[PDB]
Design a protein around this ligand. Structure first.
Ligand code: ACP
Ligand code: DGP
Ligand code: ASP
Length: 345
């Protein structure tokens, strides 16, 4: 009868805050039986455990590292490459054992790598889109053409056997959520990337908010226990003409931060980096309303600098009626680098 059991990870900036790290960290600490996401191919999530084992996932939740893993769920809002999904499953087959059920929502979108990426070539330069086919795939799903049996996982399962064992029904989806003890819902992208945030058209193809991530994962609202918001000390955007920033922030350089230029690994496009925006935090806090915050890339600043950003985040939260507590701090890309805030300050 108790229902609040979903911990939803949401980005509070323009993405790449290390949601992949907090997902894997929380999965290992909290031992969720169900890990769920609604990812699109624009988002790649990296987790590195204490032993140095690395997971770079575009389809599978990073939370599959949970010691009590029972269910892996790919939301209806998912846009995925079956090839990639196959590699990710194979890569973690030790974790995705016989007693682990992988559930692909019947309406999850199958990425047509050639056609969908080709359709995004223009926005790949114009809005600095990742051009991974995410929206092109989503639009093909929205066409709702009864003659198109190649876009949703339910229809693709009938000719592509690779996903037939994973593709479930809507009732199976709802029951898997019902039967779950503790859920880790993994949000992707970033609050300010939301289609309905102010940087349109320099945004993604959906809102990157708790309400949209819960919707895209088919999670009933009473299931939400807590929202874990993620933030970087210096927010980033992808390279190119990727959009504007907030009035209280400035575009910095990697040389200015004294850091190794961050880039999207496949294309090697250098990420745009910005100073921390309090306005962004207020905007994110207002909509996202996190209960807990993970402040990452603290290793880019002095103790004074990131300690200041912690207090900023907490006051930006209080100002927008949000009781968010910076509970976790990131000092590197691995599990060992996630510190409890109360231990370092
Ligand atoms: N504190 C830290 N210091 C240095 N590198 C870090 C770090 N935290 C994460 N990283 C690395 O930087 C990148 C952070 O991206 P990750 O893929 O985890 O972010 P994310 O899950 O938020 C991406 P998305 O915006 O697509 O949702 C990865 O390459 C990760 O290994
Ligand atoms: N860091 C990051 N940027 C993303 C992600 N998804 C979308 N974006 C950004 C890149 C572009 O500036 C913009 C549009 O990209 P796309 O959603 O691929 O069309 O959103 C993501 O998961 N991570
Ligand atoms: N941009 C994501 C995904 C990728 O490039 O493969 C990353 O930096 O990991």
């Amino acid at each position: 009868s108790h229902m609040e059991n979903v911990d939803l990870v949401i980005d509070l900036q323009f993405g790449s805050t290390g949601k992949g790290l907090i997902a894997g960290y929380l999965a290992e600490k909290n031992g969720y039986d169900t890990v769920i996401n609604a990812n699109m191919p624009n988002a790649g999530h990296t987790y590195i455990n204490a032993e140095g084992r690395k997971w770079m996932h575009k389809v599978l939740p990073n939370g599959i590292v949970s010691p009590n893993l029972k269910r892996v769920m790919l939301g209806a809002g998912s846009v995925f490459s079956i090839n990639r999904l196959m590699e990710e499953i194979e890569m973690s087959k030790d974790l995705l054992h016989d007693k682990v059920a992988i559930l692909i929502h019947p309406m999850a979108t199958v990425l047509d790598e050639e056609a969908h990426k080709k359709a995004e070539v223009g926005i790949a330069t114009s809005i600095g889109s990742t051009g991974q086919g995410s929206m092109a795939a989503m639009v093909e799903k929205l066409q709702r053409d009864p003659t198109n049996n190649t876009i949703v996982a339910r229809d693709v399962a009938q000719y592509d056997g690779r996903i037939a064992q994973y593709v479930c029904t809507v009732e199976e989806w709802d029951m898997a959520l019902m039967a779950s003890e503790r859920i880790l819902a993994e949000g992707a992208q970033g609050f300010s990337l939301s289609l309905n945030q102010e940087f349109y058209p320099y945004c993604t193809s959906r809102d990157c908010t708790p309400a949209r991530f819960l919707a895209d994962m088919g999670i009933p609202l009473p299931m939400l226990n807590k929202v874990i918001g993620t933030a970087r000390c210096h927010p980033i955007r992808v390279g190119g003409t990727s959009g504007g920033h907030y009035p209280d922030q400035e575009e910095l350089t990697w040389e200015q931060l004294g850091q190794v230029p961050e880039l999207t690994t496949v294309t090697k496009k250098v990420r745009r980096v910005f100073s921390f925006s309090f306005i962004q935090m207020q905007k994110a806090m207002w909509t996202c309303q996190p209960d807990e915050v993970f402040l990452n890339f603290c290793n880019y600043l002095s103790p004074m600098g990131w300690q200041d950003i912690v207090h900023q985040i907490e006051v930006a939260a209080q100002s927008r009626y949000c009781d968010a507590e910076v509970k976790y701090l990131g000092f590197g890309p691995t599990f060992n680098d996630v510190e409890l805030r109360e231990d370092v300050m």
